[PDB]
Ligand binder design. Structure first.
Ligand SMILES: *CCC(=O)N1CC2(CC(n3nc(-c4ccc5c(cnn5C)c4)c(-c4c(Cl)c(C)cc5[nH]ncc45)c3C)C2)C1
Ligand SMILES: Nc1nc2c(ncn2[C@@H]2O[C@H](COP(=O)(O)OP(=O)(O)O)[C@@H](O)[C@H]2O)c(=O)[nH]1
Ligand SMILES: [Mg+2]
Ligand SMILES: [Mg+2]
Length: 168
């Protein structure tokens, strides 16, 4: 059984922990401690093929670390998470993709743009804007809500589809 290292990235408060805990434990966490960075395991079946996922939920300081370059380099696929009600989190997506590409020698890294908090009626990032950003990067765009669980499996499963294609 093939095992992949997934890394969830994005600005503080976008719902990285809430998305991950929904996928793993099937419940929505409000106010999860933003200093906790931890890895989770999950066996999934996608398109009739089993994969073991090792998901790293990034947290801690928004600072550079050679140690953090080392574990990001081991990542096979990345979720680029922003919140549809926070324009700054969306503008940050460019920096996250640039950062991942740097640590991985400019490889065409499997990534999926995730537009979280889709359950909120306080949108500031247009769907067209996020689709056009994913289009120029050549990656899928998935709209999620960690609160309602809408698109949670879609986001991680689509990243696994991208990793499978890249690995071919
Ligand atoms: C509220 C807590 C939380 O959820 N956080 C998510 C983060 C921001 C994440 N993050 N920041 C960087 C980063 C920050 C500054 C910086 C670099 C490089 N140079 N500078 C000044 C990177 C990273 C980061 C990434 Cl994405 C990668 C691929 C490699 C790397 N090496 N060192 C840092 C990083 C991340 C994940 C953490 C706070
Ligand atoms: N309404 C709504 N709230 C979310 C969603 N995802 C996360 N949140 C909330 O946003 C805040 C930050 O979430 P968290 O998972 O800690 O973000 P992280 O800092 O990126 O790990 C918390 O109050 C969460 O309950 C979502 O899809 N919808
Ligand atoms: Mg967190
Ligand atoms: Mg420090």
């Amino acid at each position: 059984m093939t095992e992949y290292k997934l890394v969830v990235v994005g600005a503080c408060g976008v719902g990285k922990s809430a998305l991950t805990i929904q996928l793993i434990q099937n419940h929505f966490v409000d106010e999860y401690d933003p200093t906790i960075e931890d890895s989770y395991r999950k066996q999934v079946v996608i398109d009739g093929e089993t994969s073991l996922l090792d998901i790293l939920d990034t947290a801690g300081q928004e600072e550079y670390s050679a140690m953090r370059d080392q574990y990001m380099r081991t990542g096979e696929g990345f979720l680029l998470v922003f919140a549809i009600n926070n324009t700054k989190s969306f503008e940050d997506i460019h920096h996250y993709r640039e950062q991942i590409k740097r640590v991985k020698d400019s490889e065409d890294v499997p990534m999926v743009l995730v537009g979280n908090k889709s359950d909120l009626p306080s949108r500031t990032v247009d769907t067209k804007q996020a689709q056009d950003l994913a289009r120029s990067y050549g990656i899928p765009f998935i709209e999620t809500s960690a609160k309602t669980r809408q698109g949670v499996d879609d986001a991680f499963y689509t990243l696994v589809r991208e990793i499978r294609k890249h690995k071919e």
